[PDB]
Curated annotation (Swiss-Prot), chain A:
Organism listed in the record: Homo sapiens (Human)
Residue stretches spanning the membrane: none
InterPro entries named among the record's database cross-references: Ntn_hydrolases_N, Proteasome_alpha, Proteasome_alpha-type, Proteasome_asu_N, Proteasome_sua/b
Triggers of expression: Down-regulated by antioxidants BO-653 and probucol. Down-regulated in response to enterovirus 71 (EV71) infection (at protein level).
Protein name as it appears in the record: Proteasome subunit alpha type-2
CDD domains, alphabetized: proteasome_alpha_type_2
SMART domains: Proteasome_A_N
Subunit structure, interactors included: The 26S proteasome consists of a 20S proteasome core and two 19S regulatory subunits. The 20S proteasome core is a barrel-shaped complex made of 28 subunits that are arranged in four stacked rings. The two outer rings are each formed by seven alpha subunits, and the two inner rings are formed by seven beta subunits. The proteolytic activity is exerted by three beta-subunits PSMB5, PSMB6 and PSMB7.
Family: Belongs to the peptidase T1A family.
Example of a GO biological process term: response to virus
Sequence positions bearing Phosphotyrosine: Y4, Y22, Y74, Y119
Keywords, comma-separated and alphabetical: Acetylation, Cytoplasm, Nucleus, Phosphoprotein, Proteasome
Swiss-Prot record, chain B:
Lineage summary: Eukaryota, Metazoa, Chordata, Craniata, Vertebrata
Family recorded in the similarity comment: Belongs to the peptidase T1A family.
Stored InterPro entries: Ntn_hydrolases_N, Proteasome_alpha, Proteasome_alpha-type, Proteasome_asu_N, Proteasome_sua/b
Modified residues (Phosphoserine): S238
Protein species of origin: Homo sapiens (Human)
Pfam families the record matches: Proteasome, Proteasome_A_N
Record function comment: Component of the 20S core proteasome complex involved in the proteolytic degradation of most intracellular proteins. This complex plays numerous essential roles within the cell by associating with different regulatory particles. Associated with two 19S regulatory particles, forms the 26S proteasome and thus participates in the ATP-dependent degradation of ubiquitinated proteins.
Name by which UniProt lists this protein: Proteasome subunit alpha type-3
From Swiss-Prot, chain C:
Assigned keywords, A-Z: Acetylation, Cytoplasm, Host-virus interaction, Hydrolase, Nucleus, Phosphoprotein, Protease, Proteasome, Threonine protease, Zymogen
Secretion signal span: none
Residue numbers of the full-length protein present here: 35 to 225 of 239
GO cellular component: cytoplasm; cytosol; extracellular exosome; mitochondrion; nucleoplasm; nucleus; proteasome complex; proteasome core complex
Catalysis performed (reactions): Cleavage of peptide bonds with very broad specificity
Function, in words: Component of the 20S core proteasome complex involved in the proteolytic degradation of most intracellular proteins. This complex plays numerous essential roles within the cell by associating with different regulatory particles. Associated with two 19S regulatory particles, forms the 26S proteasome and thus participates in the ATP-dependent degradation of ubiquitinated proteins.
Superkingdom field: Eukaryota
Official protein name in the record: Proteasome subunit beta type-6
Bridged cysteine pairs (disulfide): none
E.C. no: 3.4.25.1
Intracellular or extracellular location(s): Cytoplasm; Nucleus
Active site (record annotation): T1 (nucleophile)
Family of this protein: Belongs to the peptidase T1B family.
Organism this protein belongs to: Homo sapiens
From Swiss-Prot, chain D:
Modified residues (Phosphotyrosine): Y155
Physiological role: Component of the 20S core proteasome complex involved in the proteolytic degradation of most intracellular proteins. This complex plays numerous essential roles within the cell by associating with different regulatory particles. Associated with two 19S regulatory particles, forms the 26S proteasome and thus participates in the ATP-dependent degradation of ubiquitinated proteins.
Family as reported in the entry's similarity comment: Belongs to the peptidase T1A family.
Positions of glycan attachment: S1
Organism superkingdom: Eukaryota
Sequence positions bearing Phosphoserine: S13, S59, S60
Quaternary structure and interacting proteins, as annotated: The 26S proteasome consists of a 20S proteasome core and two 19S regulatory subunits. The 20S proteasome core is a barrel-shaped complex made of 28 subunits that are arranged in four stacked rings. The two outer rings are each formed by seven alpha subunits, and the two inner rings are formed by seven beta subunits. The proteolytic activity is exerted by three beta-subunits PSMB5, PSMB6 and PSMB7. Interacts with ALKBH4.
Protein name: Proteasome subunit alpha type-6
Residues annotated with N6-acetyllysine modification: K98, K100
Keyword flag Protein biosynthesis: no
GO BP, one annotated term: proteolysis involved in protein catabolic process
Subcellular location: Cytoplasm; Nucleus
SMART domains, per the entry: Proteasome_A_N (SM00948)
Length: 232, 240, 191, 240, 220, 204
């Protein structure tokens, strides 16, 4: 190219960055999701509806593993999601080649947020449109983090992203507590996912991954049919 | 309109006007036609004299890409010269890397992808040229190709590029070209050029005929029309 | 190591020993010295093992990509041209004894020779390898123009068996291949 | 809502939209074409019409069925120049799989790598996002046949019956009305639904010389383009 | 250093020894020479010890990257193609002699890799310094499609032939049995060499060593 | 050799719940000594040390590069470093100079930061790690140190007899070496405290 390298983001006279606040609007207009940190594990659940009766549901996955104890979901736009996944995979192995030890979940979010930072400040590119929820059970205690296209990150007990997140903000505040089991957490994660779903919730409209201390695992539709088998 | 400065932007209905604008710059160029017989390809260019100080064979639009491939350009002449040097250079690498002559079906693919790359970026513009590609082989017969400024390239039996694109192929298609020899084609190309617009809004023109096929033993060269002068002896008989 | 290639009217016939040695020890007792490139073009390789394996994978990548573009079966002369480009450029770095043979729709059977220098030449029959010098005077007193396929399978089998009997780096088992318009007939022989 | 340069380049608008990519979704529709893919059985069927408006224009150099590898074939919609450059990357990166990894590329893995190239054109600016679409077929061992579809936005999916071109909303309404009952798919049922869905949406009842059929089956897993004769054999078979 | 492998009727048995020397001095009495690659593929190392360690972790990193992106079980020919293409680029400067084995969808596959980049597919291989002694047991006592315990007895016999040749080991014969479903990994499979007992009195006294300067620093 | 240019000897030994490490004190060019207070044992956090031997250039250079990477590690993570993590860190640093290698051979000794578990390992000059359960040695006088440790080591030893064993091993082996000596320093660490003693050696 010509080699311009000028950034597309500058300060308002009020002092706000306009484009990053626009990218958060595209995050809120995505598919809803929920994550709940329980006493023994972390539960992630999202809401996957095909637009037709033709689409296969065993092809694309939403709950996505990073390492064998770290998973990752999103609420935003699908195509921008696959970039940072493949980025975070290669980034996790670079830790493992140096230190010969699987990366802790706190250290992974340190580096992935710096990647999403770099597309805001640099030249000619726009930021992402994808927020994340990152989970894992490293060193006994499990973890649940959220990143955003601004580059910041937080640490949630239980939160929701996507459409109607202010409804799931209130519902999880009244439903969650200090401790549960993993099985109680999946029960209240579907009950908050049943808040904004369609008329019928099947084994294929939702898609759930968990974090045991034995490792990360996403659930097959055998269990999710048997778990939503009239358990609320 | 107001969306048509760069070639990197879309219109609100989904097209690129910078490609649309460059196509109808070729439309103002003089007519050059092409036609293939059962054992060769015959080119033909209506070329008009600038004033008088043209020196009878200057700045010709019949190029010579390879041993057996040549062009029949029309449009911006200087833009076609640089584009012809891409095709000259492309056939040399195929010779050096594979040891035999370039197939015409593959040569048109390599050029059209290079034309395609100027239709994407904002730093460059699309080409303002369109041209023909003719060749002949004993293992493949004769082929005739056609490349627009957008990069769309596929094969014809006869074609025309210029002002009278429609007005020439109206009477190309009334020829039984599947069984004619190319020596019979040469006097038939001569009338099609001479039918459309000899000196109506212009003053004078001059005819150029390129020539490849089995009679040239696979070579590509200009006709000997200084020999026998049979084009103008036969095209000017259509006065009645 | 001894490799062999004879053309006939229909196609070509290839042949080799195995015995991949290292100094005076046989590392591999049985070895595919002949390698497919396309469906009708083989090569038999000699010289360094790690060099000729690396070259043959690159030519298969280039020729296999080249024919899908043309939607045509490749020429045998096109395949022999690609080995010449890598061997002449990366000479002083490789020790390759490639012989390319195979049937072609345009031209029938062909045999090409690419020795360690980097030159290329077409021959009626071509041999190569370390133990090629021993049968080297047998082959031109026995060769006869206008053989059939079954004579050439008999011709190369007796030709390879003399070097395999004699040369210490050669021997093992005879691997043969017949390439024609119909198919590829590969067989393992001892005798 | 034009704010800054959101109607021109790839930046976010208010309300989270971005308009240049969703201008590309109807950049296909200037082609004037419709393609249909059907997976029903141990086979997979592509069908797409051609449009030949000229007698001078050839017949073999038109077909949009493109052979990627021996087991993978594809069909292209949208504009022609962006489509053929897209196939160049698909042919190229399928051979890099075989060179790097030592076996044949899956049809699922190839549609990812194509969609990631369309991602960077969406992500980075001053780079035009390739207004064309691609549908693949192929046989996967221990998985059966598959049909995939890649967007200019980089969104891919894989599904049973696929319509692309101008008439998605009419054809996909018909395919759900057809594939709701799990009828037996015996490789003649697959072609018969692939033909008669397009024959009702366009309402043509066509001659055997307008369409093509690409096919792959687990009895001959090579990609295979049907002949003009055997297209007529399936056509008179559904003539009731 | 003696490593060997075999292909029986269902899977692959790998074997190795447990000595690393420096010069002609035994540096390690127990060194793990069978390396992890994937849950179906393992690899034995010979040659430069640090070159085999850093190489076998890089490819094990990329196959974990490749299979997790693909979503299915890796292939042994993928691990072969990565190794032979890496080692050819270094022109044999990286001294690594490898035995590669695993069970794919297609079945068991055994390879041997030389540090210049030449590979061979064989039903049984031996590598290392004591490879000549171990190939004696194979070439005498191999028959195709053996059973489970017949194959484990053969490899443990072939490794033991190299141990009682020089540069053998402080013998702890290792075995890794790879099958279509079951995976085994046995570090102390056979211990033939026992160090004799110490028969002397070595009475040490709390104060038989003179100290010039002492120093105490507490902790928490 | 280049390893025999300055001499040196580093020994580590595992006890019951404690671990000991020792080194000599002599610095000198090939035959001429210079000083008797050259540090070869460096603290890397609490209850975890490292010892270096070989070319005295690369002894001081690697100990500064490793300290550079350690402090950046212990600030991105609030925890301290584990002993296995340091061994993987050092082997990465040595293998980067694969063809320009540092002429040193490290020895790492320390306890677990959470539990009481001791740890010893040593590396080559290009980074082949090697964990043991009894002792590791490095330096020019390697073979003298193997002969003492194979006879004097016992499995489960209090910090009293662990001190006397590594003292008798280092004093007798180094006096047989020519280019090593001039004093021996001993660190014996445990869960509660760290004891550093210097021994009465032959100064010849």
């Amino acid at each position: 190219e010509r080699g311009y390298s000028f950034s597309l983001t500058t300060f308002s006279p009020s002092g706000k960055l306009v484009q990053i606040e626009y990218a958060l609007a595209a995050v809120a207009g995505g598919a809803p999701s929920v994550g709940i940190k329980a006493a023994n594990g972390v539960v992630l659940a999202t809401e996957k509806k095909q637009k037709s009766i033709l689409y296969d549901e065993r092809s694309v996955h939403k709950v996505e593993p990073i390492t064998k104890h770290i998973g990752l979901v999103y609420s935003g736009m699908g195509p921008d999601y696959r970039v940072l996944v493949h980025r975070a995979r290669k980034l996790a192995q670079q830790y493992y080649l140096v230190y010969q030890e699987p990366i802790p979940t706190a250290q992974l979010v340190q580096r992935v947020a710096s990647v999403m930072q770099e597309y805001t400040q640099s030249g000619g590119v726009r930021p992402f449109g994808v927020s994340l929820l990152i989970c894992g059970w490293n060193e006994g205690r499990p973890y649940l983090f959220q990143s955003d296209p601004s580059g910041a990150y937080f640490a949630w007990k239980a939160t929701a992203m996507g459409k109607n997140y202010v409804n799931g903000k209130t519902f999880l505040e009244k439903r969650y507590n200090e401790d549960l089991e993993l099985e109680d957490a999946i029960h209240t994660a579907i009950l908050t996912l049943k808040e904004s779903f369609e008329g019928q919730m099947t084994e294929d409209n939702i898609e759930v991954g968990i974090c045991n201390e034995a490792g990360f695992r996403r659930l097959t539709p055998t269990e999710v049919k048997d778990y939503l088998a009239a358990i609320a | 309109t107001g969306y048509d400065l760069s070639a990197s932007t879309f219109s609100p209905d989904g097209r690129v006007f910078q490609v649309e604008y460059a196509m109808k710059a070729v439309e103002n160029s003089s007519t050059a036609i092409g036609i293939r017989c059962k054992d060769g390809v015959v080119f033909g260019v209506e070329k008009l004299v600038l004033s008088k100080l043209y020196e009878e064979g200057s700045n010709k639009r019949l190029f010579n890409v390879d041993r057996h491939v040549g062009m029949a350009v029309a449009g911006l002449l200087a833009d076609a010269r640089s584009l012809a040097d891409i095709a000259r250079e492309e056939a040399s690498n195929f010779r050096s890397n594979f040891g035999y002559n370039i197939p015409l079906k593959h040569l048109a693919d390599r050029v059209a992808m290079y034309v395609h790359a100027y239709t994407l970026y904002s730093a460059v513009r699309p080409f303002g040229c369109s041209f023909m590609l003719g060749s002949y082989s004993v293992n493949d017969g004769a082929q005739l190709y056609m490349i627009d400024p957008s990069g769309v390239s596929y094969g014809y039996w006869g074609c025309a590029i210029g002002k009278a694109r429609q007005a020439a192929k109206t009477e190309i298609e009334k020829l039984q070209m599947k069984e004619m020899t190319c020596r019979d084609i040469v006097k038939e190309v001569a009338k099609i050029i001479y039918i459309v617009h000899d000196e109506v809004k212009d003053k004078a023109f001059e005819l150029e005929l390129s020539w490849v096929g089995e009679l040239t033993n696979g070579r590509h060269e200009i006709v000997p029309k200084d020999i026998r002068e049979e084009a103008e002896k036969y095209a000017k008989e259509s006065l009645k | 190591t001894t490799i062999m290639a004879v053309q006939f009217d229909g196609g070509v016939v290839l042949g080799a020993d195995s015995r991949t040695t290292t100094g005076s020890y046989i590392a591999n007792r049985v070895t595919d010295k002949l390698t497919p490139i396309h469906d009708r073009i083989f090569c038999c390789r000699s010289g360094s093992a790690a060099d000729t394996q690396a070259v043959a994978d690159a030519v298969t990548y280039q020729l296999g990509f080249h024919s899908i573009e043309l939607n045509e079966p490749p020429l045998v002369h096109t395949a022999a041209s690609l080995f010449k480009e890598m061997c002449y450029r990366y000479r002083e770095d490789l020790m390759a004894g490639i012989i390319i043979a195979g049937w072609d729709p345009q031209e029938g059977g062909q045999v090409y020779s690419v020795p360690m220098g980097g030159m290329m030449v077409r021959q009626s029959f071509a041999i190569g390898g370390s133990g090629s010098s021993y049968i080297y005077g047998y082959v031109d007193a026995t060769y006869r123009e206008g053989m059939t396929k079954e004579e050439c399978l008999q011709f190369t089998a007796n030709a390879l068996a003399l070097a395999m009997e004699r040369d210490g780096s050669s021997g093992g088992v005879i691997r043969l291949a017949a390439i024609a318009e119909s198919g590829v007939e590969r067989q393992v022989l001892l005798g | 809502s034009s704010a800054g340069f959101d109607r021109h380049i790839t930046i976010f608008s208010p309300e989270g939209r971005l308009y240049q990519v969703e201008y590309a979704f109807k950049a296909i529709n200037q082609g004037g074409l419709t393609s249909v893919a059907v997976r029903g059985k141990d086979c997979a069927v592509i069908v797409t019409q051609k449009k030949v408006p000229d007698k001078l224009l050839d017949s073999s150099t038109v077909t949009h069925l493109f052979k990627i590898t021996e087991n993978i074939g594809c069909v292209m919609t949208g504009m022609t120049a962006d489509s053929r450059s897209q196939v160049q990357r698909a042919r190229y990166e399928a051979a890099n799989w075989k060179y790097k990894y030592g076996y044949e590329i899956p049809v699922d893995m190839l549609c990812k790598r194509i969609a990631d190239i369309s991602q960077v054109y969406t992500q980075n600016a001053e780079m035009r996002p390739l207004g064309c679409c691609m549908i693949l077929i192929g046989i996967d061992e221990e998985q059966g046949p598959q049909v995939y579809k890649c967007d200019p936005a980089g969104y891919y999916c894989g599904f049973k019956a696929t319509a692309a071109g101008v008439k998605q909303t009419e054809s996909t309404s018909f395919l759900e009305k057809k594939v709701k009952k799990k009828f037996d798919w015996t490789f003649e049922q697959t072609v018969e639904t692939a033909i008669t869905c397009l024959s009702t949406v366009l309402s043509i009842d066509f001659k055997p010389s307008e369409i093509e059929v690409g096919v792959v089956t687990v009895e001959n897993p090579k990609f295979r383009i049907l002949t003009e004769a055997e297209i007529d054999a399936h056509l008179v078979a559904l003539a009731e | 250093t003696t490593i060997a492998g075999v292909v029986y009727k269902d899977g692959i048995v790998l074997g190795a020894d447990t000595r690393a020397t420096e010069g002609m001095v035994v540096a390690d009495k127990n060194c793990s020479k069978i390396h992890f690659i994937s849950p179906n593929i393992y690899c034995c190392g010979a040659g430069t010890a640090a070159d085999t360690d850093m190489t076998t972790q890089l490819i094990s990193s990329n196959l974990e990257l490749h299979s997790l992106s693909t979503g299915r079980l890796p292939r042994v020919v993928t691990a072969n193609r990565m190794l032979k293409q890496m080692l050819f680029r270094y022109q044999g400067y990286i001294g690594a002699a490898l035995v590669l084995g695993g069970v794919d969808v297609t079945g068991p596959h055994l390879y041997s890799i030389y540090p210049h980049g030449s590979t061979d597919k064989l039903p049984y291989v031996t590598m290392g310094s004591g490879s000549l002694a171990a190939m004696a047991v194979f070439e005498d006592k191999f028959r195709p499609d053996m059973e489970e315990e017949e194959a484990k007895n053969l490899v443990s016999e072939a490794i033991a032939a190299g141990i009682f040749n020089d540069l053998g080991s402080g013998s702890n014969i290792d075995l890794c049995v790879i099958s279509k479903n079951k995976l085994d990994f046995l570090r102390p499979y056979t211990v033939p060499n026992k160090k004799g007992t110490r028969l002397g009195r070595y009475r040490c006294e709390k104060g038989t060593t003179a100290v010039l300067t002492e120093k105490i620093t507490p902790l928490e | 050799s280049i390893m025999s240019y300055n001499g040196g000897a580093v020994m580590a030994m595992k006890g019951k719940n404690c671990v000991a490490i020792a080194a000599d004190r002599r610095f000198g060019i090939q035959a001429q000594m210079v000083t008797t207070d050259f540090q070869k044992i460096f603290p890397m956090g609490d209850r975890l040390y490292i010892g270096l031997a070989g070319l005295a250039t690369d002894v001081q250079t690697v100990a500064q590069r490793l300290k550079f990477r350690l402090n950046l590690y212990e600030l991105k993570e609030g925890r301290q470093i584990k002993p296995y993590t340091l061994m993987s860190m050092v082997a990465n640093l040595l293998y980067e100079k694969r063809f320009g290698p540092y002429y040193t051979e490290p020895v790492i000794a320390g306890l677990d930061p959470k539990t009481f578990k001791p740890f010893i390992c040593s590396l080559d000059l290009i980074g082949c790690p090697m964990v043991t359960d009894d002792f590791v040695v490095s330096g020019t006088c390697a073979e003298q140190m193997y002969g003492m440790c194979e006879s004097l080591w016992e499995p489960n030893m209090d910090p009293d007899h662990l001190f006397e064993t590594i003292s008798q091993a280092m004093l007798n082996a180094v006096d047989r070496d020519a280019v090593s000596g001039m004093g021996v320093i001993v660190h014996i660490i445990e869960k509660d405290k760290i004891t550093t003693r210097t021994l009465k050696a032959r100064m010849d």
